[PDB]
């Protein structure tokens, strides 16, 4: 199968994904509606269920909606058995309508509709070549009040109607009783509650088994992706972990919310989409697109740094999903504003780098302050609105055009207001012009780009103000005028003579499991396959065509690989870099190091004899520890993924940038165990 078919659970870049809050979508049958104080069918009060559920899915999917618009995956609200409990926070009832409180992860919330409901929804969006993601929010169960019970369902978590337990009386320790976070540090976010939200506590083994055996039934159910929920509130060894168990089972795109504020750049967030086995969703993009196009508050060359500098910070940027608003944002159209900056919004980004995400109802330009008033009904389902045609215009080109679903970013003119970029993958080519300024055009001479010297056509016809191009000698295009508030989007196709690898998925996983390699050029017959220095070829690649490469991961060494394929002819292609190869299936243990005293600035790292813990290069150590919430300096704790069942041995560090101190005497040894989790609690050695 091509890279572009449906089936292509490993790569969604050259998808566009649209984010449906199933309560205020569509409510495809009455009959599974809630009753009573926690709903109101005509979604007055955003706070109850208004009825949106997955028949009303599977009917805007068979009416062409979506399919209208060139929607080509869906991102649904979280599908499990949420609280029944309508909760009363300050005289306002609340319910769980948005999915993110659950009661069980291993049933359906009925008002979205059973499992029955859900297998016909696969199979509509499959029909019509829509992937489907499903939220899941492995960080919590439901809000709770430890000294009163009486509160919600006591944040109560149930295994298939089996009760596992709740927040009081929690003597298994299911849950963290660590108070509140204050959001001062990451170790803080993720051992005490996000808000009054129970933490589960995914050190107890019962907690671990329960949602790795509950995302496998979701996976066997046949979806095709996963939008991890508050992933910078979870243990990040946990869950690599945890993305080693889907993967090593059944790999499918992943994305967390990782939250970044206006004009954070977080070291960490880079380092949790390079190292965890997903990707995240991209805040700083999202951030600095509602400054240039919404807010005002930064120009074209703070979207250029951005895109410069992300395309440096996320080793496969490509996977990271874009969007200009969602659910815990005001929506991006101002009600007061300019249409056209939510519509070169959407074109930016669906023509720009990574996975795109449309909230549901931007098309309709949708208004709304913050949460609940940005969850409304969608008002309607018309595809007269620039903004629907806008999408489907630029949608499908991320299925046409690999140069907009693989290919790299460069900018090719810039002032204050205009930006004109390229993307650029094998014999393809795309070159976007965005003028923000509403009130002034712009002369632009002296463009030059990478397409063949000839005249191109707006792909956008001219919807937002945009022209048609005259490229002469060289790739260099003869003057023209950029409109008020125009944008543009010129392109140009043609076969890939040469093996150019533009996608791989999974990015981490252990032998033997199939990891998915997109591009063009790869040729009709079985050519050869490298990790590393090492090579693949024959049986092992399970099948080969131009677009798309099934192969089976080598017994090579655990590590870091970087990937590179050859046609039957013997031409080598680009290299795709940072593929980690799993020493087999992991189990995510806590390791615990007793007096380890450092200097403000110093931090303690974990080291060993396995490449999950870096094989003993401290560039490559595990860290930095923890030392506030679950033990206090100066005991340093952490959560790591480590193969299961492995002796390891190891050792602790003090580092301070590079400069490293190594844990003297002999090297500390257990054996991880073979599943569930385990502490491992030892003295640091002078
Ligand atoms: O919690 C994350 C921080 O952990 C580490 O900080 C350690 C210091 O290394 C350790 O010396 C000690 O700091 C004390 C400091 O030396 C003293 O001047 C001050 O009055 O009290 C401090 C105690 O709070 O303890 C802290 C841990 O609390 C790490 O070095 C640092 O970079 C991390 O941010
Ligand atoms: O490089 C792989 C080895 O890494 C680890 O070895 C560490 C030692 O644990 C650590 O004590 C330190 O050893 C130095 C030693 O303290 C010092 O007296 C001597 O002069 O130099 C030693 C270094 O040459 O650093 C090494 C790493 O260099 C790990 O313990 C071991 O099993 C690995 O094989
Ligand atoms: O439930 C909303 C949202 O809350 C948190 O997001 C914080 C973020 O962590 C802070 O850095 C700051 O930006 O305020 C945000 C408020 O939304 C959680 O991190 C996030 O998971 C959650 O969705
Ligand atoms: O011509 C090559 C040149 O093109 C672009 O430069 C623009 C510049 O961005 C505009 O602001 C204005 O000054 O016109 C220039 C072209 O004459 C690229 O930005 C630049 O890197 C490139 O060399
Ligand atoms: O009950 C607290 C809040 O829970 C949800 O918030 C979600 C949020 O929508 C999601 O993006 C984030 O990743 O996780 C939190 C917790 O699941 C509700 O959507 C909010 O209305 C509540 O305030
Ligand atoms: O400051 C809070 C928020 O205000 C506006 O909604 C901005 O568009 C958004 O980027 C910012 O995070
Ligand atoms: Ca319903
Ligand atoms: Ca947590
Ligand atoms: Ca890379």
Redesign the pocket.
């Given at each position: 199968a091509p890279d572009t078919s449906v089936s292509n659970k490993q790569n969604f870049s050259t998808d566009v994904i649209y984010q449906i809050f199933n309560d205020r979508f569509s409510d495809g049958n009455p009959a599974n509606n809630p009753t009573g104080a926690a709903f109101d069918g005509t979604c007055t009060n955003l706070r109850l269920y208004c009825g949106g559920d997955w028949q009303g899915i599977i009917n805007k999917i068979n009416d062409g909606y979506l399919t209208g618009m060139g929607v080509t995956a869906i991102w649904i609200s979280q599908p499990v058995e949420n609280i029944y409990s309508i909760i009363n926070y300050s005289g306002v009832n609340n319910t769980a309508y948005?999915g993110?409180?659950a009661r069980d992860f291993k049933k359906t919330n009925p008002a979205y509709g059973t499992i029955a409901d859900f297998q016909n929804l696969i199979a509509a969006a499959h029909a019509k070549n829509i992937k489907v993601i499903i939220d899941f929010?492995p960080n919590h169960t439901s809000?709770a009040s430890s000294d009163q019970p009486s509160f919600a369902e006591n944040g109560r978590l149930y295994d298939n109607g089996t009760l596992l337990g709740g927040y009081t009386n929690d003597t298994q320790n299911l849950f963290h009783h660590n108070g509140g976070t204050d959001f001062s540090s990451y170790e803080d976010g993720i051992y005490r509650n996000?808000?009054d939200?129970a933490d589960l506590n995914h050190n107890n083994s019962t907690v671990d088994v329960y949602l790795k055996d509950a995302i496998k039934m979701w996976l066997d159910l046949g979806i095709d992706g996963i939008r991890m929920?508050?992933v910078k509130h979870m243990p990040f060894g946990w869950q690599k972990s945890f993305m080693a168990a889907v993967n090593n089972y059944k790999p499918v795109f992943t994305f967390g919310?990782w939250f970044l504020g206006v004009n954070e750049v977080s070291p960490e967030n880079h380092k949790f989409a390079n190292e965890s086995g997903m990707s995240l969703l991209d805040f700083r993009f999202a951030q600095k697109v509602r400054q240039v196009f919404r807010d005002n508050t930064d120009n074209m060359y703070g979207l250029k740094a951005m895109l410069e500098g992300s395309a440096a910070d996320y080793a496969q940027v490509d996977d990271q999903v874009t969007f200009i608003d969602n659910?815990?944002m005001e929506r991006f159209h101002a009600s007061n504003a300019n249409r056209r900056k939510l519509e070169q919004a959407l074109a930016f980004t669906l023509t720009s780098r990574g996975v795109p995400a449309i909230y549901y109802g931007t098309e309709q330009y949708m208004s709304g302050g913050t949460?609940p008033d940005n969850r409304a009904r969608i008002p309607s389902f018309s595809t007269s609105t620039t903004a629907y045609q806008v999408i489907q215009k630029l949608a499908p080109l991320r299925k046409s055009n690999p140069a907009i679903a693989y290919g790299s970013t460069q900018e090719r003119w810039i002032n204050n207001d205009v930006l004109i970029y390229e993307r650029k993958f094998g014999s393809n080519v795309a070159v976007v012009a965005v003028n923000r300024n509403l009130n002034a055009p712009a002369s632009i001479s002296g463009l030059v780009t990478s397409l063949p010297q000839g005249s191109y056509n707006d792909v956008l016809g001219g919807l937002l103000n945009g022209n048609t191009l005259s490229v002469g000698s060289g790739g260099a295009a003869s003057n023209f005028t950029l409109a008020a508030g125009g944008t543009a989007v010129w392109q140009y196709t043609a076969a890939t003579a040469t093996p150019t690898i533009g996608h791989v998925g999974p990015m981490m996983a252990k032998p033997g499991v199939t990891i998915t390699i997109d591009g063009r050029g790869f040729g009709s017959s079985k050519g050869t396959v490298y990790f590393g220095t090492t090579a693949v070829s024959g049986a092992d690649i399970t099948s080969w065509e131009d677009t798309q490469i099934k192969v089976k991961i080598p017994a090579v060494a655990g590590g870091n690989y970087n990937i590179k394929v050859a046609n039957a002819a013997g031409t080598a292609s680009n290299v795709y870099d940072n593929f980690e190869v799993l020493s087999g299936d992991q189990v995510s243990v806590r390791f615990v190091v007793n007096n380890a005293t450092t200097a403000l600035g110093q931090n303690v790292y974990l080291t060993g004899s396995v490449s999950e813990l870096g094989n003993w290069d401290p560039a490559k150590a595990i860290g930095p520890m923890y030392n506030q919430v679950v033990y206090q300096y100066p005991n340093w704790y952490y959560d790591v993924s480590v193969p299961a069942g492995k002796t390891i041995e190891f050792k602790f560090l003090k580092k301070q940038g590079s400069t490293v101190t190594w844990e003297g005497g002999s090297n500390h040894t257990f054996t991880a165990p073979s599943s569930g989790t385990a502490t491992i609690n030892v003295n640091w050695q002078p």
């Amino acid at each position: 199968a091509p890279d572009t078919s449906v089936s292509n659970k490993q790569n969604f870049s050259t998808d566009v994904i649209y984010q449906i809050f199933n309560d205020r979508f569509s409510d495809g049958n009455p009959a599974n509606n809630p009753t009573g104080a926690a709903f109101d069918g005509t979604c007055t009060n955003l706070r109850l269920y208004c009825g949106g559920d997955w028949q009303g899915i599977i009917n805007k999917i068979n009416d062409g909606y979506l399919t209208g618009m060139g929607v080509t995956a869906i991102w649904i609200s979280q599908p499990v058995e949420n609280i029944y409990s309508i909760i009363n926070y300050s005289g306002v009832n609340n319910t769980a309508y948005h999915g993110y409180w659950a009661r069980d992860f291993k049933k359906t919330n009925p008002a979205y509709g059973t499992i029955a409901d859900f297998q016909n929804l696969i199979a509509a969006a499959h029909a019509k070549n829509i992937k489907v993601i499903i939220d899941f929010a492995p960080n919590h169960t439901s809000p709770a009040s430890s000294d009163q019970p009486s509160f919600a369902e006591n944040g109560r978590l149930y295994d298939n109607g089996t009760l596992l337990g709740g927040y009081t009386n929690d003597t298994q320790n299911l849950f963290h009783h660590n108070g509140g976070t204050d959001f001062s540090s990451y170790e803080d976010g993720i051992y005490r509650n996000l808000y009054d939200l129970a933490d589960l506590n995914h050190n107890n083994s019962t907690v671990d088994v329960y949602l790795k055996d509950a995302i496998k039934m979701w996976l066997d159910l046949g979806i095709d992706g996963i939008r991890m929920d508050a992933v910078k509130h979870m243990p990040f060894g946990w869950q690599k972990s945890f993305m080693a168990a889907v993967n090593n089972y059944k790999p499918v795109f992943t994305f967390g919310e990782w939250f970044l504020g206006v004009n954070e750049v977080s070291p960490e967030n880079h380092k949790f989409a390079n190292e965890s086995g997903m990707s995240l969703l991209d805040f700083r993009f999202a951030q600095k697109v509602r400054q240039v196009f919404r807010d005002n508050t930064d120009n074209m060359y703070g979207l250029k740094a951005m895109l410069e500098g992300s395309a440096a910070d996320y080793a496969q940027v490509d996977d990271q999903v874009t969007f200009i608003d969602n659910h815990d944002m005001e929506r991006f159209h101002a009600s007061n504003a300019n249409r056209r900056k939510l519509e070169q919004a959407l074109a930016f980004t669906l023509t720009s780098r990574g996975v795109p995400a449309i909230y549901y109802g931007t098309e309709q330009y949708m208004s709304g302050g913050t949460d609940p008033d940005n969850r409304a009904r969608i008002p309607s389902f018309s595809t007269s609105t620039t903004a629907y045609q806008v999408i489907q215009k630029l949608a499908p080109l991320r299925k046409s055009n690999p140069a907009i679903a693989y290919g790299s970013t460069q900018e090719r003119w810039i002032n204050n207001d205009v930006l004109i970029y390229e993307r650029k993958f094998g014999s393809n080519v795309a070159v976007v012009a965005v003028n923000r300024n509403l009130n002034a055009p712009a002369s632009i001479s002296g463009l030059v780009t990478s397409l063949p010297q000839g005249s191109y056509n707006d792909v956008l016809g001219g919807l937002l103000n945009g022209n048609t191009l005259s490229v002469g000698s060289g790739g260099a295009a003869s003057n023209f005028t950029l409109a008020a508030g125009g944008t543009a989007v010129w392109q140009y196709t043609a076969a890939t003579a040469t093996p150019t690898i533009g996608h791989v998925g999974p990015m981490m996983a252990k032998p033997g499991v199939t990891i998915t390699i997109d591009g063009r050029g790869f040729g009709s017959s079985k050519g050869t396959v490298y990790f590393g220095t090492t090579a693949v070829s024959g049986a092992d690649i399970t099948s080969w065509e131009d677009t798309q490469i099934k192969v089976k991961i080598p017994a090579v060494a655990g590590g870091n690989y970087n990937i590179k394929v050859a046609n039957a002819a013997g031409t080598a292609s680009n290299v795709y870099d940072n593929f980690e190869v799993l020493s087999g299936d992991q189990v995510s243990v806590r390791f615990v190091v007793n007096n380890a005293t450092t200097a403000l600035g110093q931090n303690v790292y974990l080291t060993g004899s396995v490449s999950e813990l870096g094989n003993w290069d401290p560039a490559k150590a595990i860290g930095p520890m923890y030392n506030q919430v679950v033990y206090q300096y100066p005991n340093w704790y952490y959560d790591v993924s480590v193969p299961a069942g492995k002796t390891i041995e190891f050792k602790f560090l003090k580092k301070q940038g590079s400069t490293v101190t190594w844990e003297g005497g002999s090297n500390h040894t257990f054996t991880a165990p073979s599943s569930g989790t385990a502490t491992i609690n030892v003295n640091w050695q002078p």
